[PDB]
Structure 1
Amino acid sequence: DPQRREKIIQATLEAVKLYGIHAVTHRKIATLAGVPLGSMTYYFSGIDELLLEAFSSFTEIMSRQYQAFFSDVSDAPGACQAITDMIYSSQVATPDNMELMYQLYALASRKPLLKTVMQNWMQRSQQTLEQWFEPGTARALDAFIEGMTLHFVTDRKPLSREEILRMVERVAG
């Protein structure tokens, strides 16, 4: 029962990866969840609220990962090393994470509820960084993470770890 609701949230993310958000429906999700169609009506209302809750679950997973990179951080230089680790490890920009994250980004202009999820997600990230950095620098760093996590796993010749550290430290001021 809470089992089932969670299966449906997960199948929603699975449907986004398999079908694209545009093509996601209650029945496609129920199929992937292996639950009766009736369960969709029981736990959820509209496809957009379901998308909201599924992507919120996803970003919460991401936030826990994000924070975990700073578990051994006690100061700004340490946070720079942690951000470097976050980028260089390629653990944030995995195929699964990218496929979900960028579909969210793709449709946020068309779906206000999803833009809210992105904004909330950015806000949590900033809040993590504000433990060691000024608000503005925190935002700069999180945008730098956004771009460099992706570019690191895409570039035919990405930056070295020591190069990444130097650039993180530049942004950190």
Structure 2
Amino acid sequence: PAGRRQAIVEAAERVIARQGLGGLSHRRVAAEANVPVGSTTYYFNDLDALREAALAHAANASADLLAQWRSDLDKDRDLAATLARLTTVYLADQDRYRTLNELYMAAAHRPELQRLARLWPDGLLALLEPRIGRRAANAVTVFFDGATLHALITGTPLSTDELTDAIARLVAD
């Protein structure tokens, strides 16, 4: 039922992650979801709608991560460590971060996506400001962005240790 479209949309995220936004096709997603190819035609108006849903799913998924980030950050007082740990998790889900990055690029010239693209980074900033202050919040989100870019380019994310050091240095004071 609605679990069907769900399976299809998650597969499209997996295909977008593996093949890029332009590498998404009905045939690919149907195989990634393991459903008969026609069935991807039933739940979406066209290929572009399937893309939209995939990016939207990754954007709203990521925003609900904030809840759990907020809880973990509020538990203890070693903020840099906790942030480094949480970032390691984020950069562990390669499918999710790639797709989000595809969103960031896509939104650059498709204003129908600017709202979605802003969800996670707007949320992260807001989460961080009252907890570490504006500049630190700024520097940390920027460093986070860098971390994703380096995981993107080299295939391996910075270690939890490498992250703690850098984040520690950005939040200190």
After TM superposition, the score normalised by the length of structure 1 is 0.71
One-letter identity of the residue aligned with 1:37 = G
* Aligned-residue offset at 1:23: 2.9
2:91 matched residue in structure 1: 93
Structure 1 unaligned segments of length 5 or more: list them.
none
Cα distance 1:40–1:126, how it changes in 2: closer, same or farther (>3 A)?
Answer: farther
1:59-78 aligned within 5 A:
59-65=59-65, 67-74=67-74, 77-78=77-78
Distance 1:152 1:8 in 2: 26
One-letter identity of the residue aligned with 2:89 = Q
1:140 matched residue in structure 2: 139
8 Å contact kept, 1:4–1:35: no
* Aligned-residue offset at 1:22: 0.9
Distance 1:114 1:63 in 2: 15
* Aligned-residue offset at 1:129: 1.8
Cα distance 1:131–1:57, how it changes in 2: closer, same or farther (>3 A)?
Answer: farther
* Aligned-residue offset at 1:10: 1.2
Q: Deviations over 1:75-120 (max 9, x none)?
A: 8953333112224xx3221333343233333433233334432212
1:9-158 aligned within 5 A:
9-33=9-33, 34-35=35-36, 37=38, 40-41=41-42, 43-65=43-65, 67-74=67-74, 77-87=77-87, 90-94=88-92, 95-151=94-150, 154=154
How much identity, in percent, do the aligned residues show?
A: 21
Q: CA RMSD in A?
A: 3.5
8 Å contact kept, 2:139–2:170: yes
The 10-residue stretch of structure 1 (21-30 or 145-154) with the greater mean CA deviation from structure 2: 145-154
The 10-residue stretch of structure 1 (4-13 or 96-105) with the greater mean CA deviation from structure 2: 96-105
Distance 2:159 2:39 in 1: 50
**Number of aligned residues:** 169
Distance 2:90 2:30 in 1: 28
8 Å contact kept, 1:109–1:115: yes
2:166 matched residue in structure 1: 167
Cα distance 1:131–1:48, how it changes in 2: closer, same or farther (>3 A)?
Answer: farther
One-letter identity of the residue aligned with 2:119 = N
